[PDB]
Amino acid sequence: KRYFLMDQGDFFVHFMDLAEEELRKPVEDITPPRLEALLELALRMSTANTDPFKDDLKIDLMPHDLITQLLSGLEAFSFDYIVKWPLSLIINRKALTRYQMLFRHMFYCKHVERQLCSVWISNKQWFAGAFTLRQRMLNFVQNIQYYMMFEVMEPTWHILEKNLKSASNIDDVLGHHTGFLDTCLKDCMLTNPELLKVFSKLMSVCVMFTNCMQKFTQSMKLLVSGFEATINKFDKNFSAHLLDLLARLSIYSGMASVISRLDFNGFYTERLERL
Amino acid sequence: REIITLQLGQCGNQIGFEFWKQLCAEHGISPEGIVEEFATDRKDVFFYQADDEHYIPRAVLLDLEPRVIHSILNSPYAKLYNPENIYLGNNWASGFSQGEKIHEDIFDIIDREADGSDSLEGFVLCHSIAGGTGSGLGSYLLERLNDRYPKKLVQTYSVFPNQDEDVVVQPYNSLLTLKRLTQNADCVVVLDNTALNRIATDRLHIQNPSFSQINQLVSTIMSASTTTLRYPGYMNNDLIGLIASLIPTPRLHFLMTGYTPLTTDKTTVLDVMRRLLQPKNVMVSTNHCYIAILNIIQGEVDPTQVHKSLQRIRERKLANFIPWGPASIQVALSRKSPYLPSAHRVSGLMMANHTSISSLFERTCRQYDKLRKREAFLEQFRKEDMFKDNFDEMDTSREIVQQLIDEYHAATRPDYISWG
Amino acid sequence: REIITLQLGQCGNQIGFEFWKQLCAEHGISPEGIVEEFATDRKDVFFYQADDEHYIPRAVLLDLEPRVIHSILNSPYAKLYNPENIYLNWASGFSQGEKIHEDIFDIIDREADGSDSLEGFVLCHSIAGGTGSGLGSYLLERLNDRYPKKLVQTYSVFPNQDEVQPYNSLLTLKRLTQNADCVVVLDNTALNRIATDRLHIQNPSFSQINQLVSTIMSASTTTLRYPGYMNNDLIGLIASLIPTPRLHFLMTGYTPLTTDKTTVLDVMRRLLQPKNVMVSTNHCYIAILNIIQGEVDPTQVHKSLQRIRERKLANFIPWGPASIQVALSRKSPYLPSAHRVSGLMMANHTSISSLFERTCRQYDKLRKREAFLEQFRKEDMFKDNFDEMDTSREIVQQLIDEYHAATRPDYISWG
Amino acid sequence: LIGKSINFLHQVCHDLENAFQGKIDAAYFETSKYLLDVLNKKYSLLDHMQAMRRYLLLGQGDFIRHLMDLLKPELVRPATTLYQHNLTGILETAVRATNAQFDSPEILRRLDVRLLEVSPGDTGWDVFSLDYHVDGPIATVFTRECMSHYLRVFNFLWRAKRMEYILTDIRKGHMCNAKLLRNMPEFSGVLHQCHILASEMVHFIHQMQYYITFEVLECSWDELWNKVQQAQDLDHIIAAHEVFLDTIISRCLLDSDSRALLNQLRAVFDQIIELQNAQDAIYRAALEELQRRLQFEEKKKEEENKRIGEFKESIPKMCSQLRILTHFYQGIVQQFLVLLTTSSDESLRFLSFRLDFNEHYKARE
Known part of the structure; x- marks a missing residue:
């Protein structure tokens, strides 16, 4: 869980940065040997100096897209995990297939916002409604990314200890662990039975907010016009589906956090309500 | 790609120096540059990854007409930092002209520390807003970084010159240097001596010291706010995504x-x-x-x-x-270094666009209106008078800040689709 | 059959003296030539042994009328490198080679018969300066006029100081770009730029650059100062660069x-x-x-x-097996050192030739002006023909055109 | 296994009451180290393995080159000029006279020769090996098949050394054409088609020669120097040695798994080791011309202008006098180093990818 969901943040900030230009690309076109050298430099540059536990990390890639989890930069890769016998009581196929190919549905958020922000670099008249949507649609990524992982963190570890350390017996220990694993995931809407599927459709315009507007941060002289003609489109593409899909997931009576945390704003609390 | 956390002018070499001392406390470094015994950090970006753990910070030490620099260089932290970064006005035009005629070596030093990375993600100039070498030379470099490296984020960390009733040309220098922040800089973080005053009459039995003791406050606040850029966690590890969402x-x-x-x-x-x-x-x-x-x-x-x-x-x-969209509280945990002490056990801090900065911009702008109308504190020296034609450097800066006022006031309200 | 460090002039002697001190200390050998008494790297390629097992490094000088080398001549290191070696504007240097052309080969052929045989020489040298230019390009030519199959290389700093030197350097370029097997090179301006990274002064005092140069020159032969398994012969490694x-x-x-x-x-x-x-x-x-x-x-x-x-x-280059190639020598025990991995590097490169073109511009400036050819008598008997200088342009300019043409992908043929 | 392994210590070096699942497995401790002291020090294998890495494996290079350079006059001139009153004598002398004197004198003694089985063409290249011969128990490590395998390792590394000697003696004639060659400007313009062939050889083999260093020699040694001090049993050091020697043999272009490469590789090596005499035959003319221009320089310190016109007429042939040779060499180099994908998947992929370090294949092709 340290290496999934980018939690070794001091590695990952270096990771999607030094070799970014040959990781980010829209359709395949990665060069894995570059990030394999950065896997060494950026880990030693990160916190792996606290404990040298790197060797378990191995890169893995898609046999059959989503459903095994239970574009590049977008969803680029995910990491394999195998161990020797006493740890293998804990790490085994039904669990390690939630390893191997997960956090990819989290990686695309950090890519798409940072690539949108690379457009923001190319301009640090000028109708500020376009600038405000660049801020606003980005916040839709940033605060849900906060919700997806910067929510339940300590408790699951506090639970895991007092569960396993007291029990001692594999007949319950594996139940405690497999329960803990899903408990950590239940922040991440990566786990959702409806696939929250309007968000996946919204993603198709989200990437255009990066690439087509990066293209515009040349063709604006090579934002009052060719940004603007899409600002109205992005605006109510996102704001319609965004302010119905939380209501679609109105299941709960540390929990109910996805809904409570983008209810919180008060304006655009919803537009198409659950009730 | 990295943050070259620069620092300019003699007050800048107090407050940035104090920031690096506080950061070396917050990461955990003893005054020689020996790291603490656990090694927890994205270290190389902020203290340089040497062979034998000579963690030298990524900050310069430039001034004009040195008068406190030799005292700063005699401090015990003179091996926690001493790269080739130390190199040589009262009113703003002198620092501009002296920096222009001296720039062959100081900008070489800036370029060498800029080349001491993979690339720059930001140039954070620790900067006095109104002082005699922060104005002029500091602001001149702040332009020159926008002249030579225009698209990467030219940045500043600063104290707003908002003490009521130190520098003798306070508003005139302030809105001159705010042109370099609003136009030529790309992101800036700032503190106010009046807010720190009312906080002092809560935290402390303190008074006279003020500014030189605000060195501690500025530094501890700057360290504790930039935590997200320098410690691991599940999210928010990076400048480019985070600061853009503000x-x-x-x-x-x-x-x-x-x-x-x-x-x-x-x-x-x-x-x-x-x-x-x-x-x-x-x-x-x-x-x-x-x-x-x-x-x-x-x-x-x-x-x-x-x-x-x-x-x-x-x-x-x-x-x-009072938002325009998805804006809500970005709470999380963070990592903290072990082995460091604390008598008081809990802390939490935000750096963000809180909209109060709009009223502080109207404070410097009403102060500059009060200069444009009175003529008595025009500070019309011969060294400043034929340097620029019409003070386009500031009367435009009032308009550029009025644009910023029309946006901040709009950001305060739900009607942020436009100005107003 | 082994090799010798012929050292010459001013710069070449100074770096020659520095490596024959530094390398003696790098092995289990005392500064006076006594063995370190406790005694993985290879001596016999450049050293020889006294009858009484004292290490005699081979400071086989071939130089002319020195300004500064007398301090090296009159030192306790004369005893370390004992064997009879110390004996003596650009054209004065070249013609003061011509007056001794037998002996600057014959005594070295005697020294080569003091090995089983000699395969060749790695010469440290001055590009330009005064008397070291002309003379070094004479003696290293003579050696090979008499030896039509041996090795005679010339490693030499280039005195990039913004600048009679614009003639001395162009005649050294005409000679060495037709007379040198391989050339290691360094510049004072960028070494000053490195000195600003380490010391808070513009290195006013000079003659320190020796510490950086002398280990690089002898790194060029370190695959034979240390156990280089492949590319170990002198041309055995050089040709492959x-x-x-x-x-x-x-x-x-x-x-x-x-x-x-x-x-x-x-x-x-x-x-x-x-x-x-x-x-x-x-x-x-x-x-x-x-x-x-x-x-x-x-x-x-x-x-x-x-x-x-x-x-x-x-x-x-988009042409050729142009590459980065690694040559480990394991660290021998005989002395301590810091920063326990580094790559001391020599890179064959195009951009050295921009400084040759800048001094070609100075040469084109001076050729219209003729303010200093120094007007010496020996200079005026040997190189007053004014064809010899004009033929320097084509010889240097082909090096500029070939280095720029190699950046293109169609260098497979000549051009 | 306990009984088989422990008896050599006494021979040559000179459930039932439910009580099982204990010391019976653990009695191999007596084999695990006691045998390896006598079969490394009293009967020498710490000495001999030091001698393999330093001398027989070519794996220090110093002593190897020193013998070859004491005998440069008398190995290119055929090795029949050196016999029992020469070869074994000058080997042991060479170990004294070079830095290989930093080793134990009693150990140097077993470094001798092993000539090729039937080969009357005895020049110091086709037919040579600076063998290290073993009598007594350690002949179980270095048996008949194992000395055929070390003879093959010696042959590949000595033939790669003959590529170093030839391809760099070749460039020593080219360097004469840049050392003596300070009279005529245009001799790069003639000799370029051979100078760049030399680029497709010495510059190409720089990364090959240090590939042989890092892959074939250094990476082999880490398997075994970690191991000879420790590894239980001389029969299991022998097992580890058989895997180690097969690793060398499969890092080399020598294995039964990679025999297909050798016909293309020999076609590369042939236009290497045959070329020295041919490209020196070219310098016979240029040296003649240089020696003519040098005797004209000796006469000067006006009649020499016609030879420049004569060479201006001749130069176009002598340049194009290699185009066909260059590509007959290069074509089978290029096909070999891509055919090299049909063999050792780490070690020879490294050979393929190290050699074409950047844009020689995929760009010069």
Whole structure:
């Protein structure tokens, strides 16, 4: 869980940065040997100096897209995990297939916002409604990314200890662990039975907010016009589906956090309500 | 790609120097540059990864007409840093002209430390806003970074020259240098001596010292706010995503700060969390609202009151976002270095566009209107008078800040689709 | 059959004296030539032994009328390098070679019969300066006029000081670009730029650059000062630095220049950065021989090299096997040292020739003016023909055109 | 296994009551180290393995080159000029006279020769090996098949050394054409088609020669120097040695798995080791011309202008006098180093990818 969901943040900030230009690309076109050298430099540059536990990390890639989890930069890769016998009581196929190919549905958020922000670099008249949507649609990524992982963190570890350390017996220990694993995931809407599927459709315009507007941060002289003609489109593409899909997931009576945390704003609390 | 955390002018070499001393405390470094015994950090970006752990910071040490620099260089931390970064006005035009005629070696030093990275993600100039070498030379370099490296984020960390009633040309230098921030810089973070004053009459039995003791406050605040850029966690590890979620326009880039435990010189995180929303607790100057509220808690932890934290401050509603869209409180945990002490056990801090900065911009602008109308404090020296034609450097800067006022006021309201 | 360090003039002597001190200390040998009494690297390629087992390093001087070398001549190191070696504007230097042309070969052929035989020489040398120019390009020519199959190389700093030197350097370029087997080279302006990174003064006092140069010159032969398994013969390694012997200038550097953790993954990522080259119609890298030394892991630096091949911080040319090539010598015990991995580097490169073109511009400036050819009598008997100087232009200009043409992909043919 | 392994210590070096699942497995401790002291020090294998890495494996290079350079006059001139009153004598002398004197004198003694089985063409290249011969128990490590395997390792590394000697003696004639060659400007313009062939050889083999260093020699040694001090049992050091020697043999272009490469590789090596005499035959003319221009320089310190016109007429042939040779060499180099994908998947992929370090194949092709 340290290496999934980018939690070794001091590695990952270096990771999607030094070799970014040959990781980010829209359709395949990665060069894995570059990030394999950065896997060494950026880990030693990160916190792996606290404990040298790197060797378990191995890169893995898609046999059959989503459903095994239970574009590049977008969803680029995910990491394999195998161990020797006493740890293998804990790490085994039904669990390690939630390893191997997960956090990819989290990686695309950090890519798409940072690539949108690379457009923001190319301009640090000028109708500020376009600038405000660049801020606003980005916040839709940033605060849900906060919700997806910067929510339940300590408790699951506090639970895991007092569960396993007291029990001692594999007949319950594996139940405690497999329960803990899903408990950590239940922040991440990566786990959702409806696939929250309007968000996946919204993603198709989200990437255009990066690439087509990066293209515009040349063709604006090579934002009052060719940004603007899409600002109205992005605006109510996102704001319609965004302010119905939380209501679609109105299941709960540390929990109910996805809904409570983008209810919180008060304006655009919803537009198409659950009730 | 990295943050070259520069620092310019003699006051800048107090406050940036104090920041690097506080950062070496917060990471955990003894005054020789020996790291603490656990090694927890994205180290290389901020202290350089040497062979034998000579962790030298990524900050320059430039001045004009040195008068405190030799005292700073005799301090015990003279091997915690001493690269080739130390190199040589009262009113702003002299520093501009002296820097232009001296620039062959100081900009070489800046370029060498700029080349001491993979690339730059930001040039953060620790900068006095109105002082005699922060103005002129500091502002001149702040332009030159925008002239030579225009698209990468030219940045500043600063104190707003908002003491009531030190420098003899306070508003004239301030709106001159605010042109370099609003136009030529791309993101800036700033503190206010009046907000620090009312906080001092809560935290401390203190008075006269003020500015030179605000060196401690500025530094501890700057360190504790940039935590997200320098410690690991599940999210928010990077400048490019995070700061963009605060800054829409090429103008609206003046982030400001708020901090909970003013009793500092186990404590329930519910009262810690509500305290960050109070009018008592922001360090810059109607009841203005938050465009964002970062709070990765850096102090002690409770495994279920951290669950209650956000859910409870939703209810207390002491200051709302008054937003335009998805803006809500970015709470999290953070990592903290072991082995460091603390008598008071909990802290939480935001750097964000809180909209109070709009009133502080109208404070420097009403102060400059008061200069444009009185003629008595025009400060029309011969060294400043034929340097520029019409003070396009400032009378345009009033308009460029008025644009920023028309955007911040709009950001305060739900009608942010335009100005107003 | 082994080789000798013929050392000459001013710069060449100064770096020659520095390596014959530094390398003596690098082995289990005392500064006076006595063996370190406790006694992995190879002496016999350059050393010889007294009857009484004293180490005699071979300071076989061939120089002329020195300004500064007398301090080296009148030192206790005369006893360390005992054997009879000390005996004596550009054309005065070249013609004061011509008056001794038998003896500057014959005494060295006697020294070569003092081995089983000699295969050749690695000469340290001054490009320009005064009397070291002309003379070095005479004596190294003579050696090979008499030896039509031996080796005679010329490693020499280039005195890039913004600048009669614009003639001395162009005549040294005419000679050495037709007379030198291989040339290692360094510049004072960029070494000053390195000195500003280590010391808070503009190195007013000079003659320190010797400490950086002397280990690089002898790194060029370190695959035979240490156990180099392959590419060990003198031409055995040198020829392999070269695509064609007209692209013969070998630029230089290190991983740490401030060399007073560096593990296997970072030293080579540091190395390719523009900070690490001790010199400043397109330009490419042509080779990078880095002679890595220390506590190296030889089953992971090749893996590192494989990753550096894909890191692409060294463009190289779209033609030729132009590459970065690693040469480990394991650290021998005889002395301590710091920063326990580094790659001391020599890179064959295009961009040294921009400084040759700048002094070609100075030469084109001076050729219209003629303010100083120094007007000496020996200069005026030997090189007053004014054809010899005009033929310098084509010989240097072909080196500019070939280095610029090699940046193109159609260099397969001549052009 | 306990009984088989422990008896050599006494021979040559000179459930039932439910009580099982204990010391019976653990009695191999007595084999695990006691045997390896006597079969490394009293009967020498620490000495001999040091001698393999330093001398027989070519794996220090110093002593190897020193003998070859004491005998440069008398190995190119056929090795029949050296016999029992020469070969074994000058080997042991060479170990004294070079830095290989930093080793134990009693150990140097077993470094001798092993000539090729039937080969009357005895020049110092086709037919040579600076063998290290073993009598007594350690002949189980270095048996008949194992000395055929070390003879093959010696042959590949000595033939790669003959590529170093030839391809760099070849460039020593080219360097004469840049050392003596300070009179005529245009001799790069003639000799370029051979200078760049030399680029497709010495510059190409720089990364090959240090590939042989890092892959074939250094990476082999880490398997075994970690192991000879430790590894239980001389029969299991022999097992590890058989895997180690097969690793060398499969890092080399020598294995039964990679025999297909050798016909293409020999076609590369042939236009290497045959070329020295041919490209020196070219310098016979240029040296003649240089020696003519040098005797004209000796006469000067006006009649020499016609030879420049004569060479201006001749130069176009002597340049194009290699185009066909260059590509007959290069074509089978290029096909070999891509055919090299049909063999050792780490070790020879490294050979393929190290050699074409950047844009020689995929760009010069």
